[PDB]
């Protein structure tokens, strides 16, 4: 009795990111946290969680949207770069963490490319989620 709609995004994301360690099809490739990262990072973190959140979002976003592109998910993160004393401006993420991620989901059978030119959920990506949200929404009533 739950969708991704019913669960707050702070409790959903460590429950799907674990369920991306456990299953265990999607994994961190070594080249992606090392130095092929998104724009500028004050520090680069050596995290599995880092990879598992950038993908745990990707299964929530393709649920909501239809044709969700690479240029959309690069620009959807939120984050900047310095120019100098000129004030900062809005730039997009690293396309390397987004174009390997959709393709690690695509081999897992969670996402599929539609024939209209775009990106949509499969039933296996849609059920992996509704089960993880049925577990989260059930726990949110137990806990005062």
């Amino acid at each position: 009795m739950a969708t991704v709609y019913d669960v707050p995004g702070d409790l959903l994301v460590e429950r799907v990111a674990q369920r991306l360690k456990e299953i265990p099809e999607i994994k961190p490739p070594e080249w992606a946290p090392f130095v092929k990262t998104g724009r500028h990072k004050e520090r680069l973190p050596e995290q599995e969680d880092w990879w598992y959140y950038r993908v745990a979002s990707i299964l929530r976003r393709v649920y909501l949207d239809g044709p969700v592109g690479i240029e959309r998910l690069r620009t959807y993160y939120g984050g900047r770069k310095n120019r100098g004393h000129a004030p900062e401006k809005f730039y997009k993420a690293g396309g390397s963490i987004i174009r390997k991620a959709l393709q690690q989901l695509e081999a897992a059978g969670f996402v599929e490319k539609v024939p209209g030119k775009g990106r949509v959920i499969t039933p296996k990506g849609r059920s992996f989620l509704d089960k993880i949200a049925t577990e989260l929404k059930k726990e949110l009533e137990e806990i005062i």
Binding site: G79, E88, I143
Partner: protein
């Protein structure tokens, strides 16, 4: 996060910021009764527009009054989650939005030590931080006096809260006193009339210089 939702079940019922019942306190003086919005309810942000009328600013939730005289210091420069600031100051070179957090954490840090309803420690800090007498360099008839002028209950509150909000930013200055703390350690000691409140040191001096001159 679960306590956070208990803080959403609890303000509902009714209580300020998630867990402070607005009945715990009373305004014992009949002076500060119509000038204070202790009695009404739930959220400061409100956006109820004030100064609209003659006293369109007396009905302002005590805490909202706190938030925007705690928000005050601010020019030009640019804030966003980027690298990015300061721009929101040692007192909101920016919004009542990230202001309201400071006052909430300062209600949390003043509750943690005193253990009372903090709206009984702050309303006990804005009846003591206000001086009862002030001298204006007032001349009338071309004749320069420096005179006995007594203070009105509305202009009391304002000098109470402002001197509370002016004292903390001298201490928070590039110091571990966080405003959530530096305010929470000002609000306890203005409630007490302690010798450590830069807000009860002007209260006194403004009455004492004003007694000499009268």
């Amino acid at each position: 996060a679960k306590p956070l939702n208990e803080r959403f079940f609890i303000p509902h019922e009714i209580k300020v910021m998630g867990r402070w019942s607005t009945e715990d306190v009373e305004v014992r003086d009949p002076s500060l009764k119509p000038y204070i919005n202790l009695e009404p309810r739930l959220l400061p942000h409100t956006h109820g527009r004030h100064a609209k009328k003659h006293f369109g600013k007396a009905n302002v939730h005590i805490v909202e009054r706190l938030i925007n005289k705690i928000m005050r210091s601010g020019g030009s420069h640019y804030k966003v989650a980027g690298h990015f600031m300061r721009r929101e100051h040692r007192s909101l070179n920016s919004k009542k939005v990230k202001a309201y957090e400071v006052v909430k954490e300062a209600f949390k840090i003043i509750e943690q030590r005193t253990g009372k309803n903090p709206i009984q420690v702050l309303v006990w800090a804005i009846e003591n931080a206000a001086p009862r007498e002030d001298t204006t360099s007032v001349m009338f008839g071309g004749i320069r006096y420096h005179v006995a002028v007594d203070i009105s209950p509305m202009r009391r509150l304002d000098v109470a809260l402002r001197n509370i909000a002016l004292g903390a930013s001298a201490k928070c200055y590039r110091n571990k006193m966080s405003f959530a703390e530096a305010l929470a350690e000002e609000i306890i000691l203005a409630a007490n009339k302690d010798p450590k409140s830069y807000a009860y040191s002007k209260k006194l001096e403004i009455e004492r210089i004003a007694e000499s001159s009268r």
